[PDB]
Each structure stands twice: as C-alpha cells, then as structure tokens.
From a paper:
Presynaptic neurexins (Nrxs) and postsynaptic neuroligins (NLs), both of which are type I membrane proteins containing a single-membrane spanning region, are two potential regulators of this process since both are physically capable not only of linking the two opposing membranes via their ectodomains, but also of recruiting specific sets of pre- and post-synaptic proteins near the junction. The α-Nrx ectodomain is comprised of three repeats, each containing an epidermal growth factor (EGF)-like domain flanked by two LNS (laminin, neurexin, sex-hormone-binding globulin) domains (also called laminin G (LG) domains). The shorter β-Nrx is basically an N-terminally truncated α-Nrx, containing only the last (6th) LNS domain at the ectodomain together with a short β-Nrx-specific sequence at the N-terminus. Despite the “extra” functions carried out by α-Nrx, its NL-binding specificity remains narrower than that of β-Nrx; α-Nrx can only bind NL1 isoforms lacking a 9-residue insertion at the splice site B (the “B- variant”), in contrast to β-Nrx which binds NL1 regardless of the insertion.
In the present paper, we provide for the first time a description of the crystal structure of an ectodomain fragment corresponding to the third neurexin motif of bovine α-Nrx (NX1α(III)), encompassing the domains LNS5-EGF3-LNS6. The NX1α(III) structure, refined at 2.3 Å resolution, contained one molecule in the asymmetric unit, including the LNS5 domain (residues 867–1045), the EGF domain (residues 1046–1084), and the LNS6 domain (residues 1085–1261). The central EGF domain was sandwiched between the two LNS domains and physically separated them, thereby making the entire molecule look like an off-centered dumbbell or “handset”. In contrast, the N-terminal extension from the G1086TTYIF sequence of the LNS6 domain in NX1α(III) emanate away from the domain almost perpendicularly, due to a kink at Pro1085. Consistent with previous reports that Nrx1β has the potential to bind Ca2+ at the hyper-variable surface of the LNS6 domain, we found a clear electron density peak at this site. The Ca2+ coordination assumed an octahedral geometry, as opposed to a more typical pentagonal bipyramid, using two side-chain oxygen molecules, two main-chain oxygen molecules (Asp1139, Val1156, Ile1208, and Asn1210), and two water molecules (right). The side-chain of Trp1065 was deeply inserted into a cave at the top of the LNS5 created by the Cys1015–Cys1043 disulfide and the interdomain linker, resulting in numerous van der Waals contacts and hydrogen bonds with more than 10 residues in the LNS5 domain alone (left). The interdomain contact observed between the EGF3 and LNS6 domains was similarly extensive and buried 832 Å2 of ASA, although the nature of the interaction was drastically different from that seen in LNS5-EGF3 (right).
Residue numbers in the entry: 867 to 1261
Write the structure that this text describes.
C-alpha cells in the first residue's frame, strides 16, 4: 500500500512523534539492495529510544525503555537486501514482551525491570539529519540512512502517508517503488566478474578476473619481468601473519617460457606450508602444502606459453582445490592421502620466481590473493613491498 522510494541513503522524512507508551505495534514492508541503513528512529526523555535498521542485510530492532539499550535480531535465513519485498512486524505488550516478525520467522524477547517507553522527538523514517548520526545511541550501528522502498507503514491504527503527513522531507523521495531498472544479467560484468546489484544500477567485483574498471574490462596493474630476472615480495607485518582454511588466487600473465615460477606464498621459517603457482612444460599449475603431502593441480591441456594473455584462477578449500585457465573447463582436485585444512602463518608473497630458481620472464597483471591486490600495492609503494632486479611497472 502506497509505496514510497528513498532514492538516497541521506533522504528521510520526519513524522509526528510515535506514541508507544504502554504498548507498541509497528508494521511495514521494505525492499532494498543495500546491506546497511537506518530505517526508523524516535528518541524520548532521558535515554529512551527505538531504532529499526539494516546491518549486513539483517533487520535489527534496537531500543531503550529507560533501563538500558537492548538489541533484537530479526530472524532470517538470508540477508534481506535481495531486491524483494519483506514484511516487518514489531510489537511490545504491556508487560514488555517484544515480538519481531520478519516474513514468517518470529523472534521474542522480554525486558526485565523496564516501565514505559516515553518517546518525544519526531519519528524519523528513511534516515536522520547527517549530524544526528554522531549522537545516536552507542548500540546503533548505522552511520547512514536507508535506501530503497517502504510501503504499508502502520504505527498501530495510524497509517501515515510518508509524504503528505511528513512534517519535513529531505532529499530524493518519490511516490511508487522506483527500483533498479538495470538489473544484474549473466553478461553484465566481463571476464567472469561478479555482478553486485545496487539501487540505481550495478557494480562489478573484479577480484578473481585479473582485470579492473567498472565492468572488469580494463587491464589490471601490470609488471614486466625482463633479462636477468626480478622479484616483488610482500612481507606480512610479523603480527598480522594470516592462517586460512580457504584461499583465492587470480593473476593474468603472458610469457613464452616452458618453465617458471610466477607466485609463491610461504609460511614463516620452520613451517612447511606453501602455495606455488608455476609453469611446467608450458602448462600452468599449482602445487601446495598445508601440513602433510604436497597437492598438485594442473591444466594439462592448455598450452599457455604462446606469448598471449591468459588468466588463471585458483581456489583452495582445505585440501580441495580448483584451477581454471581462461574459459576452459574448471579442474577439480580432491586429495589422495590424508590432509589438514589450514594454511598456517603465511609470511611472504614472492612474485617473479628468481629466488625459487625458476625466474619468470614476461608480464604479470592484476594479482589478487585473499583480499590483497598485490601488484596494485606495489604500484602504490606499500611499505611491506620490496621490488628487486629487472622488474618495471607498465605505466
Ligand atoms: C572437500 O571435498 C569433500 C567432498 O566434496 C567435502 O565433503 C569436504 O567438506 C571438502 N573439504 C573442505 C575443507 O572444503
Ligand atoms: Ca597447516
């Protein structure tokens, strides 16, 4: 009923104070693509307040009845920012039993030692003034407003028109639900990029593509390795050495060599764990160790030392691994022999193969490893990057 669109997070409306003194019943429907946003705020005397907000895609109901801030997490199997309509029901009875109903799932919670809820400010819907965020209750996570569609707002036998009954409107607000008209299709992002739906369009996660730009169509950061060999080393701050159950690696390359090491991830001294991306007999492959036997996975059918650009993508889950060159079928490997799951205490990323006795010659582009765009960081002179030998940035 009467959908209204908040086109930006910063947009909100202010209605007359919600009266929820001895009991409360709120209902509304929402539709959004964003993970975070303040949907509803009303404060009162002393520390009294209510808040409804999305946090990481989940509906949170935060409140203070006068004896301390409390949080109820609405129950859902999925995050709710899926561009689908969701029903939200929030009630409080006279004994202070709260109920939160998100679609079909019910969550209940009682507050002991509380009396009544004394709300006094206007009721803010969609967000608040930008300078209000800094004096929000500590338990409230929102630093920005809600973006999306609200409909059927029921404040307990009070059915306001969010536009006509508003005492104040801020920013871009319309009647109707103006959802995204350009939605994520299979070919929205190039080069196997992951399409992420936004409110006014889409963006692309290019992490595993070796490419950059808004559509994963632009060349990634590139270095060239020439005569004599070179090396780019990333060393983790000794305290921030990660240990992982799952690894993700992507890089683009061009070369004519039939033997070389491109990337090696090593654990610190006295530990045997490592991850190695290499070319053997003109075929790209990965060898790794997470505590027992070496595990090898190879694309044995694609000859990749033709001097043409290629993309390689590697995933590890415990002992399990996948490898894919370009658009060839994905290679899967499930270990022979017994295995552990953690890649312990990762200390260095060595790019160029010189120290491993297999120097790389050619170009490397858009290296990504567990959140780290390593070649980008080298280009931006990160303090944990060391570059030696015959290596240069393709500017
Ligand atoms: C590896 O693969 C097996 C078989 O599909 C699966 O059951 C297991 O959970 C996987 N292990 C890890 C650590 O992902
Ligand atoms: Ca290990």
């Amino acid at each position: 009923a009467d959908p209204v669109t908040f086109k930006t997070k910063s947009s909100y409306v202010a209605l007359a104070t919600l009266q929820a003194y001895t009991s409360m019943h709120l209902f509304f429907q929402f539709k959004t693509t964003s993970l975070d946003g303040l949907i509803l705020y009303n404060s009162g005397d002393g520390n009294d307040f209510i808040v409804v907000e999305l946090v990481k895609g989940y509906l949170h109901y935060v409140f203070d009845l006068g004896n301390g801030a409390n949080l109820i997490k609405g129950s859902s199997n999925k995050p709710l920012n899926d561009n689908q309509w969701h029903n939200v029901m929030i009630s409080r009875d006279t004994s202070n039993l709260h109920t939160v109903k998100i679609d079909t799932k019910i969550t209940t919670q009682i507050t002991a030692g509380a009396r009544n809820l004394d709300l006094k400010s206007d009721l803010y819907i969609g967000g608040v003034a930008k300078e209000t965020y800094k004096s929000l209750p500590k338990l409230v996570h929102a630093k920005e407003g809600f973006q999306g569609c609200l409909a059927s707002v029921d404040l307990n036998g009070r059915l306001p028109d969010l536009i006509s009954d508003a005492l104040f409107c801020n920013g871009q607000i319309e009647r109707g639900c103006e959802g995204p008209s350009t939605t994520c299709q299979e070919d929205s992002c190039s080069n196997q990029g992951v399409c992420l739906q936004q409110w006014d369009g889409f963006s692309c996660d290019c992490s595993m593509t070796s490419f950059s730009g808004p559509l994963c169509n632009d060349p990634g950061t590139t270095y060239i390795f020439s005569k004599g060999g070179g090396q780019i080393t990333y060393k983790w701050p000794p305290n921030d050495r990660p240990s992982t159950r799952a690894d993700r690696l992507a890089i683009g390359f061009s070369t004519v060599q039939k033997e070389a090491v491109l990337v090696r991830v090593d654990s610190s001294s006295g530990l045997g764990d490592y991850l190695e991306l290499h070319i053997h007999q003109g075929k790209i492959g990965v060898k790794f160790n997470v505590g027992t036997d070496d595990i090898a996975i190879e694309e044995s059918n694609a000859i990749i030392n033709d001097g043409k650009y290629h993309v390689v993508r590697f995933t590890r889950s415990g002992g399990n691994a996948t490898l894919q060159v370009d658009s060839w079928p994905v290679i899967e490997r499930y270990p022979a022999g017994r295995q552990l799951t953690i890649f312990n205490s990762q200390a260095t990323i060595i790019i160029g193969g010189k120290e491993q006795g297999q120097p790389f010659q050619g170009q490397l582009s858009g290296l990504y490893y567990n959140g780290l765009k390593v070649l980008n960081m080298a280009a931006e002179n990160d303090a944990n990057i060391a570059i030696v030998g015959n290596v240069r940035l393709v500017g």
